[PDB]
C-alpha cells in the first residue's frame, strides 16, 4: 500500500534547510499492491528564444 503524506509550510529563507519543527498529515492512501524498486524526480525547463 503506497502511502503519501503531505504538508505545506510558508517558509521565508534564502537557502539551506530551515529550522523549526512541525508534524505530518495524510493526503491519500492508494492500494496499488505492487513493489517499487527505483524512482526518479522529473523537473521542468524554461524555454525562450
Amino acid at each position: 500500500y503506497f502511502k503519501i503524506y503531505s504538508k505545506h509550510t510558508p517558509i521565508n529563507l534564502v537557502r539551506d534547510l530551515p529550522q523549526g519543527f512541525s508534524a505530518l498529515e495524510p493526503l491519500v492512501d492508494l492500494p496499488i499492491g505492487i513493489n517499487i524498486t527505483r524512482f526518479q524526480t522529473l523537473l521542468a525547463l524554461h524555454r525562450s528564444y
Binding site: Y1, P31, G33, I34, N35
Partner: protein
C-alpha cells in the same frame, strides 16, 4: 475441456502478500540454462487445466 484458465507451476522465490505476478518467463529448475529456447531443464510455468 476448458483451456481458458492457466496456473503457475513453480517459482524460484516467494512473493509478498497482496501481490499479482504477471511474469511469463522461462522457468529454470536446475542446470543447462534456458535463454528462451526451452530445452533441457526448461519447463513453462503456466500450464493448462483439465
Amino acid at each position: 475441456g476448458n483451456y481458458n484458465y492457466l496456473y503457475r507451476l513453480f517459482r524460484k522465490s516467494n512473493l509478498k502478500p497482496f501481490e499479482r505476478d504477471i511474469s511469463t518467463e522461462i522457468y529454470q529448475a536446475g542446470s543447462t540454462p534456458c535463454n528462451g529456447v526451452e530445452g533441457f531443464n526448461c519447463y513453462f510455468p503456466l500450464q493448462s487445466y483439465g
